[PDB]
Each structure stands twice: as structure tokens, then as C-alpha cells.
Ligand binder design. Structure first.
Ligand SMILES: NC(=O)c1ccc[n+]([C@@H]2O[C@H](COP(=O)([O-])OP(=O)(O)OC[C@H]3O[C@@H](n4cnc5c(N)ncnc54)[C@H](O)[C@@H]3O)[C@@H](O)[C@H]2O)c1
Ligand SMILES: NC(=O)c1ccc[n+]([C@@H]2O[C@H](COP(=O)([O-])OP(=O)(O)OC[C@H]3O[C@@H](n4cnc5c(N)ncnc54)[C@H](O)[C@@H]3O)[C@@H](O)[C@H]2O)c1
Lengths: 286, 294
């Protein structure tokens, strides 16, 4: 049976490992700098083996998956370039940004290795391999950003490796990926955190706010409970897009202030009607 | 004559003005714990007819006056600007001396000022705000349990004695809500911060994304959990939210100026490129959100 290496045996890694095993009879060897995490992954039948030697495992693998944070993936690509991999190997990652990863891949592996950037656009904030599920990516978009030299059949192969995910796969270039995910994922995380911060500022002075924020406000700001480390890293890696979006946003807020100041019931109703038309225009998932 | 008889001959009467999500839900909660006749009135005939089909109301009111004049409890579940307008018509009617009148408006200041101007010392008007609901509209989506374990704010008029507030709590015990008596200024201040201002930001977030979606259709398609969860409330009734912004305009203007200053500070933090300061921003948000009770 074919061999898979999973580097980073956490929520997203474990989830992908389970989705592969669901639709494919394969040996998944796990590697993590956190021994307890990969040991637990083995206990839970998310991986079949723990890698002593990262080199031996990678050199025999048909598929290598990086589910490590993007800075750790970037560092480990340099090690992967020093190894003698199979000629047919497919290498992928799960990073929320693709710019840095694909630049590093182009510098190290051009023409030799099939590296395809990945971004499964779904996740529980519930963490660890403990919380990994085969169906975590069901009906979610999964972005693939192939290197320049990668032929189409290798992208279709990777889609087949990951068909167990139940995801809608979409090929984007790096620039498209970081632009759209900056607007639809990264920027909303910034606003959610800011919304929680503004409410906390008032909660200090009135404890009823703390009691009432536990209802509707807590539910809509769920993403603000995501890993601060992970999201600091994402903001750093998509900083230029997010800076341009924040200046747009401040200008949008100055226009909304002018609308509310005007006191025009019709203009205020138009504002909400326009937002409602767009929000209702998004398709229902699963 | 009813003074010769110790026992009630006919069950008590409730009027529901506005037979929609919140109105229907409250009607169902009242009927759960009380044997009463609920008569429905709505400017939308289809809505009140459907409310009657679904056994949310027992009767449809032809005449708003006749219905109100025989009612023990009158509930306004109309949008807040429509409630405010309807109070002057209620003041022209000859209601029962024991009547309790309440609303479920998301804002209370404008409504209670109108009530004080019309009914002082005569009518027991108690403002209401159930702190539970949905972006979904219509009696079709109404549920008896919608307010279970949610706060329900009451803003009694200055003259209303405690026993009438306790009566209204008993009328609405079926809600399973935690009832809380607030003044109008406290209510509109806290709901402005926790509910009204977030609705403005959700709509703004949708508007900013739409500006880019025009030029790149993938933005529309790739919108996921992060975007969809925080913007769900932008699907709420524009009429309802235009009314709320009008009735809490001065607080929302002050909160928007704070917000713009907060966003200017966040821009300086992201511009600095300091991973620690950016991490502190998210860590502070996470520690507060995790500190809210469950
Ligand atoms: N969590 C999400 O919502 C989400 C969604 C899509 C993509 N992603 C991407 O997936 C990555 C992982 O997310 P997660 O939720 O699985 O995080 P996680 O912490 O649950 O798992 C990441 C794992 O990588 C391991 N790791 C760290 N450095 C490593 C190294 N040098 N070698 C090997 N393993 C290493 C960690 O020990 C951990 O087990 C994120 O950094 C992000 O880029 C996350
Ligand atoms: N939706 C929520 O989450 C929520 C929560 C708490 C309070 N509220 C408040 O409840 C009230 C109604 O909200 P909803 O969610 O039930 O809305 P809705 O649109 O589902 O129902 C309101 C109903 O009132 C009717 N109506 C409008 N103007 C009227 C008028 N002049 N006379 C009679 N009927 C009229 C509408 O036709 C509709 O059936 C609003 O004041 C709103 O602020 C809403």
C-alpha cells in the first residue's frame, strides 16, 4: 500500500489524515516536534506509525502533507530539498496564506518536485488531534496553488488523495488566494477581535454588559476565541492586503457615521437592505 | 352582572399588535402557562391569517379599538417607530382600568417618553425587550421557547406600581426568561453597545466585501465560517434596524467615533509589524470572550 507522511499531527493534519484513510488503504507515518501530539495521533488511529527519521519516511512517501504552522513549513521545505524523494511524490501544505510558502517552494524545488500549496477553508477552533474529524472539511472550499511546473494530472491526483474530505476543490494562483482570503477570512477575524475589545472597554464600567454580551454577541464573535498566535502569524503574512483593507474600512465607517448623522430613515434603511441583499446572496453550506 | 358571581365566566383576553417572530413567540409562551383568548392585529393580513392557521392567535381583530377595549393584556410586537406612532391611537380608546400594556421594542427611550406624554397615572404601560430572537422574520419562525434562559428587560412607567410589574412577569412566566427592571437610559446604553452597534458593523463588513466581490466573483464564492457567522445578523429586517438606529442615533454616533479611533489604533499596530502587539490584540479579545458566562 502507498505511504503518506503527515508533518504536524494536529487538528487540520489529523482531520486530513482521517479523510485520506476513509477513501484510501495507505500507511500514514506521523511527525511532530510535540511527541505527545503524534503519540496521541497514533493512539486514535489518525496515523499508523510515528517517524523516528523524517528523511527515511519522506524518501519512501507517495504523498507528504505539511500541517505545521507556515513559519515551520517554510523552515522544513529547506530540509525536504536536501532529501532524495520519489520522482512521482506529491507534496502539499494547509497554510491559511500561500505567498511565503509558494515563494520558498519556487526558490528550493523548481522543476524537480510536485509541490501544491493547500488551504482547507474550514476549521473548528476546538484544538489538538483529539478534535480531528474526517468530515471537518465537508462541503467547504479547499484551495490548491500548484507550482508553475506542476502538470494538471498531479493536481487531479491530489484532489483524488483528498476526495474523502468532501470538499469543493478550487485551483487558484498565490496572488488570487491571498487577496480573496484576506477579504473573506483574515479581515473579518480582525473586526471580530476589535468588536470584542470595544465591548470589553464598556463592560469594565457596567457588569450588566458582561451578562448581556453572553447572549447574541458571544455567538457572532466565536472566531475571536481562535489561537492568537496563529492569527498574529496570519496578519503578519498578509499584512500589506490587511493594511489596505483597514484604510478602506476606516473610510467605510466615516461614511456610515455621515449616514447615521444625517438621520435619514431611508438612507439608513438602504444601508441595511444592501447588506441584507448581499448576505442573502451567499449560498447555504451543507 | 359579574359582581354577583365569585368565578370568571369567560377567560381573559390578550391583544397582539404585530403577529410576527417576536409577537408570535410571546403569544405561544403566554398560552403555554395561561388559558386565554389571544386576538391578533397586523397591517399584513397574510401574516395574521397565518398566525391564526398555526394556532398562535385564536381570533383576527377586525376593529383594533373593540379588541383593545376588552383586553386584560395588550402587546405591541411592531417595529419600534410603528409602536411609538400607535400609542396615540391607544390613548383615544376607553381601556379596562386593570389593563397592562407592554411592547417588545429593541429600544425603549423614545417609546417610554411617548407613553409618559400620553398615559401618565392612567394606564399601566411597561416597556419590554426580550434579549433573544433571529435575523429570520414572520410568525412562520415563532417558537414558545425562543426566550428560554434569555434576559427580558422591563421599563415600567414612573407611576406603575410593583404589583403590575409582578403581574406582567406572571403573564410572561411561560417565556422561561430572566426578567430585569431597568431605566430607559441604562437599557438603550447597554443594548446600544451589545446589540445595536454590532448590527452596524456586520452590515458595514458585508458592504466592504460586496465592493470587492463586484470585480472578483471568487470573493462571493469563498465566503466561509469566519465571514458568514459574524454577518448572519445583516439578514435582519432593514425596517426594524432603520427604526432602532433612529431611536438610538446619538449613542451609535458616539460608538462609531470610538470605533473609528479603535480601527486607527489597530492600523498603527498592524503597520508596526510587531508580532507581539498583534498577538496581544487577539489574546485580549480571546480572554474577554472566554470570560463571558455559559
Ligand atoms: N485552525 C484553523 O482554523 C485552520 C484552518 C485552515 C488552515 N489552517 C492552517 O493549519 C495550520 C495548523 O492548524 P491547526 O489548527 O492544525 O494547529 P495545531 O496546533 O492543532 O496543529 C499544528 C501542529 O503542528 C505541529 N508543529 C509545529 N511546528 C512543527 C514542526 N517544526 N515540525 C512538525 N510539526 C510541527 C504542532 O505541534 C501541532 O501539533 C495553521 O498554522 C494554519 O496555517 C488552520
Ligand atoms: N428579531 C429579533 O431578533 C428581535 C428581538 C427582540 C426584539 N425585537 C423587536 O420585536 C419587534 C418585532 O420584531 P420581529 O422580529 O417580530 O419582526 P417581524 O417583522 O417578524 O414582525 C413584526 C410584525 O409587525 C407587523 N407590523 C409592522 N408595522 C405594523 C403596524 N403599524 N401595525 C401592526 N403590525 C405592524 C409586521 O407586518 C410583522 O408581522 C421589533 O420592535 C423588534 O425590534 C426583535
Amino acid at each position: 500500500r502507498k505511504k503518506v507522511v503527515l508533518i504536524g499531527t494536529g487538528l487540520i493534519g489529523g482531520s486530513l489524515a482521517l479523510a485520506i484513510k476513509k477513501d484510501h488503504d495507505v500507511t500514514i507515518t506521523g511527525y511532530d516536534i510535540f511527541q505527545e501530539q503524534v503519540e496521541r495521533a497514533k493512539e486514535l488511529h489518525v496515523v499508523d506509525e510515528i517517524a523516528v527519521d523524517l528523511q527515511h519516511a519522506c524518501e519512501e512517501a507517495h504523498l507528504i502533507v505539511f500541517a505545521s504552522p507556515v513559519e515551520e513549513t517554510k523552515k522544513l521545505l529547506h530540509k525536504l530539498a536536501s532529501f532524495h524523494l520519489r520522482e512521482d511524490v506529491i507534496v502539499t501544505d494547509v497554510g491559511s496564506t500561500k505567498g511565503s510558502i509558494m515563494n520558498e517552494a519556487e526558490a528550493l524545488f523548481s522543476k524537480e518536485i510536485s509541490f501544491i500549496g493547500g488551504h482547507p477553508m474550514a476549521g473548528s477552533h476546538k484544538t489538538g488531534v483529539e478534535s480531528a474529524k474526517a468530515h471537518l472539511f465537508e462541503n467547504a472550499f479547499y484551495i490548491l496553488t500548484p507550482m508553475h511546473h506542476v502538470p494538471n494530472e498531479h493536481v487531479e491526483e491530489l484532489k483524488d488523495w483528498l476526495k474523502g474530505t468532501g470538499s469543493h476543490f478550487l485551483v487558484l494562483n498565490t496572488e488570487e488566494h491571498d487577496y480573496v482570503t484576506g477579504i473573506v477570512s483574515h479581515f473579518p477575524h480582525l473586526i471580530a477581535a476589535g468588536l470584542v475589545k470595544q465591548v470589553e472597554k464598556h463592560a469594565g464600567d457596567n457588569p450588566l454588559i458582561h451578562q448581556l454580551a453572553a447572549g447574541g454577541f458571544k455567538d457572532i464573535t466565536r472566531i475571536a476565541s481562535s489561537s492568537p498566535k496563529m492569527w498574529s502569524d496570519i496578519v503578519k503574512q498578509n499584512r500589506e492586503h490587511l493594511m489596505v483593507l483597514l484604510k478602506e474600512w476606516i473610510s467605510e465607517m466615516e461614511d456610515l457615521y455621515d449616514t447615521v448623522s444625517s438621520g435619514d430613515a431611508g438612507e439608513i434603511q438602504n444601508y441595511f437592505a444592501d447588506a441584507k441583499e448581499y448576505r442573502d446572496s451567499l449560498p447555504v453550506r451543507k
